[PDB]
Amino acid sequence: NKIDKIEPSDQKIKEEYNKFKYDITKQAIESLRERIPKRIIFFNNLVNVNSEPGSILNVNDLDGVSYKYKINKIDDKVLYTHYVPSHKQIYLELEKIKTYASELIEIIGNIKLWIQLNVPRIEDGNNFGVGIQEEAIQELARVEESAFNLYDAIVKYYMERAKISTKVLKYPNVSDYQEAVRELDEKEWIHIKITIVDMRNNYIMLYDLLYKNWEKVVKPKN
Amino acid sequence: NKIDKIEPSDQKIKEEYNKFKYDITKQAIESLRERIPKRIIFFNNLVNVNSEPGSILNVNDLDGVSYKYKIKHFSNNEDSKLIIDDKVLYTHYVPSHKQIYLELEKIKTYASELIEIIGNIKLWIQLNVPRIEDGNNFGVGIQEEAIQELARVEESAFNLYDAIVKYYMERAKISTKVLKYPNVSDYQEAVRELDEKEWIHIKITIVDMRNNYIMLYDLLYKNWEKVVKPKN
Amino acid sequence: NKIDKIEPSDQKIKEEYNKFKYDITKQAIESLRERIPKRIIFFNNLVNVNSEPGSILNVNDLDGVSYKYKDKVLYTHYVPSHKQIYLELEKIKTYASELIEIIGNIKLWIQLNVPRIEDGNNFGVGIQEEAIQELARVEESAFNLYDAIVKYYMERAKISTKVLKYPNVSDYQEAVRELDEKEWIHIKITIVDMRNNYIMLYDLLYKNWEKVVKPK
Amino acid sequence: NKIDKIEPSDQKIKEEYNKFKYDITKQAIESLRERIPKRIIFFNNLVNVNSEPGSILNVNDLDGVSYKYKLYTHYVPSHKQIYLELEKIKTYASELIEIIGNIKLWIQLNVPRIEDGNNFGVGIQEEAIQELARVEESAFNLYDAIVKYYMERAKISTKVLKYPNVSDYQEAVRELDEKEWIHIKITIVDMRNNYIMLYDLLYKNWEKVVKPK
Amino acid sequence: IDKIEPSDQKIKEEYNKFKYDITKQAIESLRERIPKRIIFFNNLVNVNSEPGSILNVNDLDGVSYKYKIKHFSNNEDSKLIIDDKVLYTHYVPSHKQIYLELEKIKTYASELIEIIGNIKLWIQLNVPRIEDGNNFGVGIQEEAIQELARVEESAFNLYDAIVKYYMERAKISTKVLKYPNVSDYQEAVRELDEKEWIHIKITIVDMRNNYIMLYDLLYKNWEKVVKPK
Amino acid sequence: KIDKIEPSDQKIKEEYNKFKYDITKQAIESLRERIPKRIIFFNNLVNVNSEPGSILNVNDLDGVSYKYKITHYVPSHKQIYLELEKIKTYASELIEIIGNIKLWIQLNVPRIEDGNNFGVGIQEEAIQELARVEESAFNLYDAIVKYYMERAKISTKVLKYPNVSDYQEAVRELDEKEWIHIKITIVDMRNNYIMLYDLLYKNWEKVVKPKN
Amino acid sequence: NKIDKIEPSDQKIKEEYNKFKYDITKQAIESLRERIPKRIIFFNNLVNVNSEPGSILNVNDLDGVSYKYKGHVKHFSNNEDSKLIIDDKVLYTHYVPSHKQIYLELEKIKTYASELIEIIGNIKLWIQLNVPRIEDGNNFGVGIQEEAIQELARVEESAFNLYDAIVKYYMERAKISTKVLKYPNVSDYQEAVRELDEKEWIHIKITIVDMRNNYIMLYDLLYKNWEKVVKPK
Structure with a gap:
């Protein structure tokens, strides 16, 4: 009542799938040898590690x-x-x-x-x-998940800033509403810079982590 | 009060039930041999792994x-308040x-x-x-x-239907705010960002399709012997 | 520190109680031999496993x-x-x-x-x-369907209220449409979960029946 | 650092205290021998186990x-x-x-x-x-749940008055009533089943419940 | 230096008196105050009562x-500006x-x-x-x-819950005034009062039952509570 | 590279060591004097010998x-x-x-x-x-803002519905709750000082030298 | 399926990468030997441990x-304390x-x-x-x-949350001030503004102490365990 082999039946698909596993390996090695180190330098040029405190x-x-x-x-x-x-x-x-x-x-x-x-x-x-x-x-995945949440957070900035602006229009002399807009902008500005540092540092720890454990990542058994 | 068989009494149901278990096994094997590999190539053709960074x-x-x-409704009164x-x-x-x-x-x-x-x-x-x-x-x-x-991949896909309703509801709410507050420019930027968020989420959803189909196929393929006979 | 036996004192009640335990076992076996298999095939006829992908x-x-x-x-x-x-x-x-x-x-x-x-x-x-x-999980899962249905009508009504207030804001009208499309999918997924839950319960009891009845 | 016995000082209270412990034991045994079996048959007569599916x-x-x-x-x-x-x-x-x-x-x-x-x-x-305690807490939450029914039904009814043609609001009132109707009957079945499993549980483990050592 | 006994000897004595005064008060509660309250609450909700009579x-x-x-005596049952x-x-x-x-x-x-x-x-x-x-x-x-601590914390929440009763009753009563046609708002007030009435009585039983299980617990395990070693 | 992390500035090394000395000074002073003084102080406000219901x-x-x-x-x-x-x-x-x-x-x-x-x-x-006692006391500042905010909200409803008496009863009950909460806080102060002092006193030998 | 080495191809990149790892170590050691102790004394100067209780x-x-x-700027100078359209x-x-x-x-x-x-x-x-x-x-x-x-990371996230709490302060103060304008008869709304400001003043000072204590607890942790932090094997 059964056969228990699950190789893809279509031979053209079987090759295209195998080509896919080859193409990933290329992209993965390529990112580690070229793309990621360059991105480390890229973000470092934006937020230099040698900066004095408060200068970033x-x-x-x-x-x-x-x-x-x-x-x-x-x-x-x-x-x-x-x-x-x-x-x-x-x-x-x-x-x-x-x-x-x-x-x-x-x-x-x-x-x-x-x-x-x-x-x-x-x-x-x-x-x-x-x-x-x-x-x-x-x-x-942790680093990936962190970057993924940024898209939704940015919509919250505009929504929150707009809400405060409505209050400024209703109470244009109540100054704490205007200070709230300023503080919201200053917070977003700081968060942006901390995000850029997190980019720089995440590329570095991920590269360092994979480089050190590369032999077990590729051949995890004997 | 000491019978120990619970096979279906109706012989027509016993046949229909056994056929159902056969049809499951049939469809499951077909999904692994054809349906999934075909989709792996399909989604890869949409978001190719060889793409340059930032192109997806x-x-x-x-x-x-x-x-x-x-x-279109109320064609006589454009951009106005009515009672x-x-x-x-x-x-x-x-x-x-x-x-x-x-x-x-x-x-x-x-x-x-x-x-x-x-x-x-x-x-x-x-x-x-x-x-x-x-x-x-x-x-x-x-x-x-x-x-x-x-189950994780299945639940993730299941949540998409509810999330799409939220997009239109959220886009509709902000648009009402733009109509009430055309002075607050951030309401217009919020609409703009919402569309940009949904556009990115759409593309990331497609990549997750490609990657989930492959890891599930690769996972089942490697452990196929224990998945069918976990004890013999 | 007195007497420590608790069979029901009224002898007629003792009979109706013992009769009740018989009536459950009959119904339980009947559910396993007919009611559940009959329903598995029914829901499958509504969302057939042999359907091509996306046709369900x-x-x-x-x-x-x-x-x-x-x-x-x-x-x-x-x-x-x-x-x-x-x-x-x-x-x-x-x-x-x-x-x-x-x-x-x-x-x-x-x-x-x-x-x-x-x-x-x-x-x-x-x-x-x-x-x-x-x-109990399957029972609790099915039990929550009644509340989810009240929420559908409530949510549809609120959005419809928004359409009346903003008849040209088109996303409110898309939201109604998507809401109905969502419920249509959820209805069918509910039927699949019914089918799959009944069989997984049936398959579970069938395989372990000896330990379910006489665990010792 | 003085005295290390804490028997009740008032002998009249000491008597009333022991009488209470007697009265509890009496009431508990009566509940298991009469009160609980009586209610099992009672609730079964309202939601008979022999009912066809969907008839309850x-x-x-x-x-x-x-x-x-x-x-x-x-x-x-x-x-x-x-x-x-x-x-x-x-x-x-x-x-x-x-x-x-x-x-x-x-x-x-x-x-x-x-x-x-x-x-x-x-x-x-x-x-x-x-x-x-589980069954007791489950029954205790019923009083608050009932207040929510009227509060929830009142809220929807307000919307029907404000939007008398949005029919989903009227469907919401209807569906809410049907939901409360179903929950009522599920509660009665849970009564019957809880009384039986509690009685059956105590009966089976009675010797250790009374003499655990 | 590695000793931390209080420097002020008058304070050092008052501290020892406090530990003595606690021990005094605790024993008095176990020997007199708690049993008296067990009977007190039982006299309010007697265990021998038939079901539903409590x-x-x-x-x-x-x-x-x-x-x-009554305020604003000129305009009764009205809305003002x-x-x-x-x-x-x-x-x-x-x-x-x-x-x-x-x-x-x-x-x-x-x-x-x-x-x-x-x-x-x-x-x-x-x-x-x-x-x-x-x-x-x-x-x-x-x-x-x-x-x-469980019994103590349980009783502590009663003060906060009582404020919610008046707030909730007032909120619903507000809705009855706004929607005199919504009959369920009138039903909600009734049920809230009926709920509070039941909750009050269950609280009294929990008092009675907590005093007894606490007293019974301490009496049975008294030897290990004082000399656990 | 080099594997020492003593502060490089000799002036900072002294300022830092003085700080650690000053900490030990204040902590012992708190255990020998400040805390016992607080025990008697708070007890005189909520005396343990009080009859039930008098606190x-x-x-x-x-x-x-x-x-x-x-x-x-x-x-x-x-x-x-x-x-x-x-x-x-x-x-x-x-x-x-x-x-x-x-x-x-x-x-x-x-x-x-x-x-x-x-x-x-x-x-x-x-x-x-x-830390538990400290976190408990820290939340008191935030809780006090909520009292006035909650009281003001109810008073707002009393102004809108001056004949709905339950809103007026809510104000009274809120004040009575805060009055009770104030006193339970003082008892918790008294009791926490003793439980902390008693705990540290009994285990003082291991708190100072946990390894010999 | 070929070669399993992933060293950067450009020798120039390896230098900037190795230079970067050296530059971090410089900054980290500089922070532990100088920057952090200096900050400990600094925050202590703002909330001195020797202060008598309640003086902080x-x-x-x-x-x-x-x-x-x-440093504000009054607007709508013609109509003061009024409602406009x-x-x-x-x-x-x-x-x-x-x-x-x-x-x-x-x-x-x-x-x-x-x-x-x-x-x-x-x-x-x-x-x-x-x-x-x-x-x-x-x-x-x-x-x-x-x-x-x-x-x-716990300390880093803790400091990160201060920016949002500050936005919450102004939003909260503005809302209550709005209530004072609507209900000048409710005296408790005015007390809430006062208490809110008093709460933030205390929270500011507790934040400074938490800074001081975190800097020393981190420094004390690394100093005591320095040999295993650098060479754990």
């Missing part, structure tokens, strides 16, 4: 005047007596953050998939090297 | 202009993202077929769990691990 | 035009309910009602079959607990 | 027309039928809480002095107290 | 304190019967926290130096403190 | 002077305000005293080694209780 | 009168200032938190880079390394 995580280049509450005393924000514009400077920086996050997820996802495809058949005993594989997969 | 998870092909706030049927009424038009709609429809298709295929492979293994015994059940642990990984 | 969990047979935004007062804002989904939801509740009755009595019978607590040689009693737990 | 948990006896939404004012009445059925539930739950609490307390009063080893029978006692 | 609602006034479809804000003159009385019963509940809870609190503290102060092994009696001490 | 009562609570008045305002409970200020003082001094005793024990955990570190568990047990 | 966590230096409701919507000209004293103190907190995040991240990364190749057995010292990394 500061708020001095943050424009606190161009994008605050304004009064007016084929169109735009001119038919209204008071508007509250968005922080274009933070917008431009957030756009860069998403690019760093996308390219990270692509790179990490294929390296993680490659290690998963290298996990051997489950057996009893002598699978200490498999734990190393699992630790690497775990750390890769 | 980008937003360059997302129309960010055709479906933003503009300045109709004793209630307040906004004849302000804010369109949906026709581009995202078409992509979201395809996602549900990928999710539907995944639940059907993965669920049956999971069901087949579950129905293949042996009688509970003490000891010598290491192979049962392999069965449980496979069922867990199969 | 789809939305092709869902009417998406008859019940969208278009008598009691001299009104203009009328928004009907999805009569097609209503009929399917009514069928779901019967499936859930019949499940709780069938599974609950099988569970009670197994509970009544747990022996006196003793130390050791109770591996089969652990099997009994697994069966009772799995039966 | 149905909605056929639920009035779905008398209590729906009605110059012209418009009111929304309560489901007087569900009111009537919910009142009985609170009666069933109250009598259960009274009965189980004293049986649970009696076993608690029968838990021995803590010793090392040979306290396997105490585990039987603990298991029994756990199940009694 | 947890019923027959003695609850459900008619005197419902909304009748004062200081540019909305004003409702509508009168809705409080449930005076439940108020009197709740006041007693707070008294029972206050006396419980004081009595149970000192017994718990006394046992805690009797925990020996932490050592490895031969600490089976310390587990008994820990078990007693846990049950003592 | 946790509401008899001394002014419940009429600060109710809804008559154009209509709603005043604050000045009596509770004065008692809340004292509560904050007790909590501040507690955090300061307990924090240094906790910090000193944390600074006294030895170098990590494998096995024969039963005494380190005692240190951890002591730190856990010290 | 008090409210005596808090201006609670200058900024309550009767602007862009067909509701508007309250009412002026309610911020607490400049709390503002200045919060600005200092953010610098303390930023410099902490910068310092801790490099020490943590350095230890992460110093965790050896995974091997079976003799990895008791790696547990020390992991424990050290764990505590470093």
Whole structure:
């Protein structure tokens, strides 16, 4: 009543699948030999490890005047007596953050998939090297998950900033609402810079982790 | 009060039941030999592993202009406030993202077929769990691990249907805020970001399809001997 | 510190109680020999395992035009309910009602079959607990369907309220459509989970029947 | 650092205290020999185990027309039928809480002095107290759940008045009533089944519940 | 330096007196205060009562304190505009019967926290130096403190719950005024009062039963609570 | 590279060592004097010898002077305000005293080694209780803001519904709750000081030298 | 399936990578030998351990009168403390200032938190880079390394949350001030503003102590376990 072999029946698909496992290995090795070290230097050029404290995580280049509450005393924000514009400077920086996050997820996802495809058949005993594989997969997914949540967090920034702006329009002299907008912008600005450092450091620990344990990641058994 | 057989009494049902267990095994084997490999190539053809970094998870092909706030019902009164049927009424038009709609429809298709295929492979293994015994059940642990990984992918795809309703609800809510507060520019940026978020989530969903289909296939292929006969 | 035996004092009650334990066992065996297998085949006929992928969990047979935004007062804002989904939801509740009755009595019978607590040689009693737990999970799972149905109508009503207030904000109308499409899928997934739960319970009891009845 | 016995000082209270321990034991035994079997047959007569599937948990006896939404004012009445059925539930739950609490307390009063080893029978006692407390807490939550029904039904009814043509709000009232109707009957079955498993559990492990050592 | 006895000798004595005074109060509670309260609460909810004679609602006034479809005597049952804000003159009385019963509940809870609190503290102060092994009696001490703390914390939450009753009753009563056509809002007030009435009585039983299981627990394991080693 | 991490600046090394000396000084001073003084102090406010119900009562609570008045305002409970200020003082001094005793024990955990570190568990047990009481006192500042915010909300409802009496009963019950909560806090102060002191005193030998 | 070495192909990249690992070690050692002890004494100078009880966590230096409701910029100067109709919507000209004293103190907190995040991240990364190749057995010292990394991340996340709490302060103060404008008859709303400011003043000072204590607890942890943190094998 049964056959118990599950090789793909279509021989053309069987080759395309095997070509796929080859192509991943290329991308995985390629990321480790070229892409990732270059990205380490890239983010380091943005947040140099040798910087003195407070020279990275500061708020001095943050424009606190161009994008605050304004009064007016084929169109735009001119038919209204008071508007509250968005922080274009933070917008431009957030756009860069998403690019760093996308390219990270692509790179990490294929390296993680490659290690998963290298996990051997489950057996009893002598699978200490498999734990190393699992630790690497775990750390890769953790970094990947962290970058994935950035896209949703950015929508929350605009939604939260907009809510406060409505309150500023209703209570334009209650100053704590305006300080809240400023503080929201300053917080997002700091979070952006901490994200960039996390990029730099994550690429480094992931590269260092895989490099040290490369022999067990590839051949986890004898 | 001491009978110890519970085979179905109806011989027609006994036949229909046994045929059902056969059909499961049949469909499960077919999914592994053809349906899954075909989809591995399919999704890879959509998000190729050989793509250059940033060429998959980008937003360059997302129309960010055709479906933003503009300045059909109630054709006589455009962009106005009405009092109709004793209630307040906004004849302000804010369109949906026709581009995202078409992509979201395809996602549900990928999710539907995944639940059907993965669920049956999971069901087949579950129905293949042996009688509970003490000891010598290491192979049962392999069965449980496979069922867990199969169930995780299945549940992840199942959550997509509910999440899509939230996209339209969330997009609709913010658009109301743009209509009430055209001065708060962040409400317009929030709509813009929401579409960008959904566009990225769509593409990451497709990659997860590709990768889940392969690791599940690769996992089952490697442990196939213990998944079928966990004790002999 | 007086007398320490507790058989029911009224002898007529003792008979009705013993009769009750007989009536459960009959119903429990009957559920395993006929009621559950008959229902497994029924739900499979609704979501057949032999269907091509996507032909089960789809939305092709869902009417998406008859019940969208278009008598009691001299009104203009009328928004009907999805009569097609209503009929399917009514069928779901019967499936859930019949499940709780069938599974609950099988569970009670197994509970009544747990022996006196003793130390050791109770591996089969652990099997009994697994069966009772799995039966209770399926019972609890089906039980929550009634509340989920109330939420569907409530959620559809709120969105429909939003469509009346913002008749040109198109995403509110998409949200109604997607809500109905979601329920249509959930209805079918509910039927699959019914089918799969009944058989996994049946397969579980069948394989371990000896330890379920005589764990010692 | 003075005196190390804590027997009650008042001899009249000491007598009343022991009488209470006697009265508990009496009530508990009476509950197991008469009160619980009597209710098992009682609840079974309301939800007979021999009923065909769906004949218990149905909605056929639920009035779905008398209590729906009605110059012209418009009111929304309560489901007087569900009111009537919910009142009985609170009666069933109250009598259960009274009965189980004293049986649970009696076993608690029968838990021995803590010793090392040979306290396997105490585990039987603990298991029994756990199940009694579980059933008691389950019945206790019914009073708060009933207030939510009226609160929830009132909320939806407000929406029907505000949006009298959005029919899903009217379906929500109907569905809520059908949900409460089903929950009522599931509660009655849970009563029957709880009384039986509690009685069956105590009967089987009676020797260790009374003499754990 | 490695000794930390108090430098002030008057303080050092007062501290020893306090440990003595606690031991005094705890024993008094076990010998007199607790048994008296066991009988007291039992006289309120006698164990010999037939089922339903305790947890019923027959003695609850459900008619005197419902909304009748005093300040601002000129405009009765009306909506006003004062200081540019909305004003409702509508009168809705409080449930005076439940108020009197709740006041007693707070008294029972206050006396419980004081009595149970000192017994718990006394046992805690009797925990020996932490050592490895031969600490089976310390587990008994820990078990007693846990049950003592559970009863104490349970009673402590009653003060907060009583505020919620008045807040919830007022909220629903507000809805009855806004929606006199929604009959379920009127049913909700009734059920809330019936719920509080039942909860009050179950609280009284829990007082009775907690006093007994606590007294029985300490008496049976008294030897290990004082000399766990 | 190089494998020493003594502070490079010789001036900092002295300033740092003086700090660790000052910590030990303050912690011992707290255990020998500050804490026992607090035990007697709080006991004199909630005497253990009090008859039941004489502590946790509401008899001394002014419940009429600060109710809804008559154009209509709603005043604050000045009596509770004065008692809340004292509560904050007790909590501040507690955090300061307990924090240094906790910090000193944390600074006294030895170098990590494998096995024969039963005494380190005692240190951890002591730190856990010290932090628990400190965290409990820390939340008092936030809880006080909630009192006024909650009281103001109810008073807002009383102004909107001046004849719905349950809203007025809610104000009264809130004040009575805060009055009781204040006193339970003082007892918890008294009891925590003793349980911490008694715990440290009994296990003092292992708290200081957990390994010999 | 070919070669299983993944050294960077460009020798130039290997130099910047190796230079980077050296530059971290420099920064980490510099932080442990100089930066952190300096910070310990600094925060101690703000909340001195030798202070008598209640002299630190008090409210005596808090201006609670200058900024309550009767460097900002008053708007709608023609209509003061009134309701207006602007862009067909509701508007309250009412002026309610911020607490400049709390503002200045919060600005200092953010610098303390930023410099902490910068310092801790490099020490943590350095230890992460110093965790050896995974091997079976003799990895008791790696547990020390992991424990050290764990505590470093806890402190780093703790400081990170200060920025959001500061946004919450202003939002909370603004809402209550809104209530004071609507209900000047409810005296408890005015007390809530006062208590909110008093709460933040205390939280500011407790934050500074938590800084001080975390810097020393991290330094004390690394100093005592230095041999196993660097060479666990």
